[PDB]
Amino acid sequence: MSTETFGFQAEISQLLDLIINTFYSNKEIFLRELISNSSDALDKIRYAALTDPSQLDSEKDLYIRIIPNKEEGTLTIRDTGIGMTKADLVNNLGTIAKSGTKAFMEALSSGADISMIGQFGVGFYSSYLVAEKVQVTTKHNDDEQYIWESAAGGTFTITEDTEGPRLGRGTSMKLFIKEDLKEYLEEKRIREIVKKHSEFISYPIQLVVTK
Ligand SMILES: CCNC(=O)c1noc(-c2cc(C(C)C)c(O)cc2O)c1-c1ccc(CN2CCOCC2)cc1
């Protein structure tokens, strides 16, 4: 249960400051990128299953589920993707991201839009447009379950998950929404965003509504 504290790569910290401290209007594009990242993770496990199906034993259902928690003020995006290993959390959210993170700001200096963040493979960091803190719970078939957490203060912590709920396989991403942005926890707002930005994705998008 030991927590290892790591620091963001310099370009990622530099980019993370550009997302938080700059004012943008349609911050709703974060959900498009988090669903798209969930869809890409779902693609990788079907392709792994085509090679070896024993990979779906962890969880046979492939879906994308959104769980807004108004009382906790969190938006959770759970998908049964291939998941990430402890190594992958550092090497997929870093190093591979460095070329894209730099290329994004090189495009942003050329006058690009914040919505193009997905074309540079760093669409996850757009979640900090609406989230003050992000808890990424992941589980890959060949590794253990880990909780990645960061408030974009230049440091991120990876914790081996031993007391949280089992995922089996996939990635559960808990976004701690800023108080002025609780609109992204409303039922109607989430759905009109999903239909607007993620209409044509192959996997089923699920929303947990509570009455
Ligand atoms: C290495 C094999 N495993 C995975 O790729 C994986 N499993 O779960 C992933 C999710 C990641 C995120 C954020 C933290 C990146 C989500 O919001 C949702 C996921 O399912 C997730 C993932 C999916 C896509 C990406 C970014 N891609 C896409 C753009 O190019 C770079 C790589 C990064 C991570």
Is 88 one of the annotated binding-site residues?
no
**Could you tell me if 20 and 133 are in contact, meaning their C-beta atoms sit under 8 angstroms apart?**
no
107 CA to centre of own chain = 22
Of 126, 128, 127, the C-alpha closest to 117 is 126
Task: Find the 84 Cα to ligand 1 centroid distance in Å.
Answer: 8
How far apart are alpha carbons 152 and 15 in whole angstroms? 10
Looking at the DSSP bridge assignments, the partners of residue 55 are: none
Q: Residue ranges of the alpha helices (H) in 52-186? A: 86-92, 96-108
- The answer to the question of whether 79 is labelled as a binding residue is yes
Give the CA count within 13 Å in the CB-facing half-sphere of 142. 7
Contacts of 83 (CB under 8 A, 6+ apart): 41, 45, 138, 139, 140, 141, 143, 167, 169, 170, 171
* Spacing, Cα 87 to ligand 1 middle (Å): 13
Which residue's C-alpha comes closest to atom 14 of ligand 1?
124
- Tokens 């290892």 correspond to 4
Q: Report the C-alpha gap between 168 and 16 in whole angstroms.
A: 30
Residue given tokens 């193009």 in the structure block: 116
In degrees rounded to 5, what are phi and psi of residue 50? -60, -45
Pocket (CB within 6 angstroms of ligand 1): 34, 37-38, 40-41, 44, 77, 79, 81-84, 88, 92, 121, 124, 136, 138, 171, 173
What sign has the CA pseudo-torsion 187, 189, 195, 201?
Answer: negative
Strand partners for 136? 148, 173
Kindly give the distance from the C-alpha atom of residue 211 to the centroid of ligand 1, in angstroms, as a whole number. Answer: 32
147 is written with which tokens?
């909780």
1 annotated as ligand-binding: no
38 CA from centroid of ligand 1 (Å)? 6
**Resolution of the entry in angstroms:** 3.2
Q: Which of 84, 85, 67 is nearest to 75 (CA)?
A: 67
34 CB burial (10 A radius; 0-12, 13-18, 19+): buried
Which residue, judged by its Cα, is nearest atom 27 of ligand 1? Answer: 121
Side chain identity, residue 206: Q
Rounded distance, CA 207 to CA 211, Å? 13
Buried b (16+ CB within 10 A) or exposed e, 142-153: ebebbbbbbbbe
Is 174 in contact with 164 (CB distance < 8 Å)? no
Q: Whose CA is nearest to atom 25 of ligand 1?
A: 37
Q: Give 154 Cα–ligand 1 centroid separation in angstroms.
A: 20
User: Which atom of ligand 1 is found nearest the CA of 121?
Assistant: 29
